[PDB]
């Protein structure tokens, strides 16, 4: 069912800076005490970030292409932001992937997908119980299946500081999507703090499907509803990066060569 | 043996390693047609 | 995966889950994880 809503409102493109966000570790190949260069799909140092602030007067769901990867944010509380739509054509003819948890492990189903125009979380405001999960709608020709390991998880809605900062990175590969993922918490008004925070490999798939679309999926409250927390895309560039590592094994301070003239001599 | 079938009408080359399943009706110029126009048909076709 | 000559020995890391190898400083293996749960460093230069 097409249960699209009435006050769903764009705001007019709040740009933010990528500051130095983005760096992950590009292998499982450890090392300690150097500075590797590697030339793979990261996102820039810098950039325009398209922020959505998504609040009570602002619904934000649009369709967003893919572009060679994205770059992904989400400043919430209590875990608001899963589910995301890998799509083709973002239609029933569409080879689609979805990306979403039943509240206790999260659950990957590619196959084709009569996508509505407004399926949602039925999230109850005080209970956060996804009783209208009616994203599994019909199924026909279905391809993949996967579940995760099942681990705790909050629904509803919260507030105070900013605890929860998920950082994601959505890279498409070879046939492979690749998912990387990395956790701190901040405190900022709402803006995007400065800083780095490394990812993580994850998750590797080997679907093969024609990534060219995606949007992320909400949770309406119970009319829907939102809280103050937003969330940040950025889209991803095939350039080349130092990294220094500690003698610990962890990335402590990345630098790109395409930004400036003195980052290239550093990584020269 | 007609159960078997290939696709031949895609708009452009392919990445590595990904598969075109949905059967769309072709045309050179987007234009969701109704085969048999023409200019528009199925990319599907069988081997014999 | 790999094959190679050398002298074992215990490591000192702070290995990753995810990572299995080492190639210390430019494709140098030197530390491995065991596939039967142990992280051992590698001196393949035995001694020449």
């Given at each position: 069912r097409c249960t699209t809503f009435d006050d769903v409102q764009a705001p007019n493109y709040t740009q933010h800076t990528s500051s130095m966000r983005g760096v992950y570790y590009p292998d499982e190949i450890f090392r300690s005490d150097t500075l590797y260069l590697t030339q793979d799909l990261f996102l820039p140092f810098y950039s325009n970030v398209t922020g959505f602030h998504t609040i009570n007067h602002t619904f934000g769901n649009p369709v967003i292409p893919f572009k060679d990867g994205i770059y992904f944010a989400a400043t919430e509380k209590?875990?608001?932001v899963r589910g995301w739509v890998f799509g083709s054509t973002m239609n029933n003819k569409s080879q689609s992937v979805i990306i979403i948890n039943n509240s206790t492990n999260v659950v990957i189903?590619?196959?084709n997908f009569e996508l509505c125009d407004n399926?949602?979380?039925a999230?109850?405001?005080?209970?956060?119980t996804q009783t209208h999960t009616m994203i599994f709608d019909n199924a026909f020709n279905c391809t993949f299946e996967y579940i995760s390991d099942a681990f705790s998880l909050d629904v509803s809605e919260k507030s105070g500081n900013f605890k929860h900062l998920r950082e994601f990175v959505f890279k498409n590969k070879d046939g492979f999507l690749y998912v990387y993922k990395g956790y701190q918490p901040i405190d900022v008004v709402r803006d995007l703090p400065s800083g780095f925070n490394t990812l993580k490999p994850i998750f590797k798939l080997p679907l093969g499907i024609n990534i060219t679309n995606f949007r992320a999926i909400l949770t309406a409250f119970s009319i829907w509803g939102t809280s103050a927390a937003a969330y940040?895309?950025?889209?991803?560039?095939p350039t080349?990066?130092?990294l220094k590592y500690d003698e610990n094994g962890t990335i402590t301070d990345a630098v790109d060569c395409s930004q400036n003239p003195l980052a290239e001599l550093k990584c020269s | 043996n007609y159960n078997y079938k290939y696709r031949y009408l895609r708009h452009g080359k392919l990445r590595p390693f990904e598969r075109d399943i949905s059967n769309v009706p072709f045309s050179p110029d987007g234009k969701p047609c109704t085969p048999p126009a023409l200019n528009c048909y199925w990319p599907l076709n069988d081997y014999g | 995966?790999?094959?190679?000559?050398?002298?074992?020995?215990?490591?000192?890391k702070r290995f990753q889950p995810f990572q299995q190898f080492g190639r210390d400083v430019s494709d140098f293996t030197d530390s491995v994880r065991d596939p039967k749960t142990s992280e051992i460093l590698?001196?393949?230069?035995?001694s020449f």
């Amino acid at each position: 069912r097409c249960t699209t809503f009435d006050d769903v409102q764009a705001p007019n493109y709040t740009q933010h800076t990528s500051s130095m966000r983005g760096v992950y570790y590009p292998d499982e190949i450890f090392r300690s005490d150097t500075l590797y260069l590697t030339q793979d799909l990261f996102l820039p140092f810098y950039s325009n970030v398209t922020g959505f602030h998504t609040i009570n007067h602002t619904f934000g769901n649009p369709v967003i292409p893919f572009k060679d990867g994205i770059y992904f944010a989400a400043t919430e509380k209590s875990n608001v932001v899963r589910g995301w739509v890998f799509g083709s054509t973002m239609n029933n003819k569409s080879q689609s992937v979805i990306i979403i948890n039943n509240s206790t492990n999260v659950v990957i189903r590619a196959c084709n997908f009569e996508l509505c125009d407004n399926p949602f979380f039925a999230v109850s405001k005080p209970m956060g119980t996804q009783t209208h999960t009616m994203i599994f709608d019909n199924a026909f020709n279905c391809t993949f299946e996967y579940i995760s390991d099942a681990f705790s998880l909050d629904v509803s809605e919260k507030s105070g500081n900013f605890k929860h900062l998920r950082e994601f990175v959505f890279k498409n590969k070879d046939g492979f999507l690749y998912v990387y993922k990395g956790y701190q918490p901040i405190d900022v008004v709402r803006d995007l703090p400065s800083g780095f925070n490394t990812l993580k490999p994850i998750f590797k798939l080997p679907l093969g499907i024609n990534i060219t679309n995606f949007r992320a999926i909400l949770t309406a409250f119970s009319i829907w509803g939102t809280s103050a927390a937003a969330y940040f895309v950025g889209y991803l560039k095939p350039t080349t990066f130092m990294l220094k590592y500690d003698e610990n094994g962890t990335i402590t301070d990345a630098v790109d060569c395409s930004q400036n003239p003195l980052a290239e001599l550093k990584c020269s | 043996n007609y159960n078997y079938k290939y696709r031949y009408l895609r708009h452009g080359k392919l990445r590595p390693f990904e598969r075109d399943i949905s059967n769309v009706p072709f045309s050179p110029d987007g234009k969701p047609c109704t085969p048999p126009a023409l200019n528009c048909y199925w990319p599907l076709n069988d081997y014999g | 995966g790999l094959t190679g000559t050398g002298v074992l020995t215990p490591s000192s890391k702070r290995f990753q889950p995810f990572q299995q190898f080492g190639r210390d400083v430019s494709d140098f293996t030197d530390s491995v994880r065991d596939p039967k749960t142990s992280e051992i460093l590698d001196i393949s230069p035995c001694s020449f």
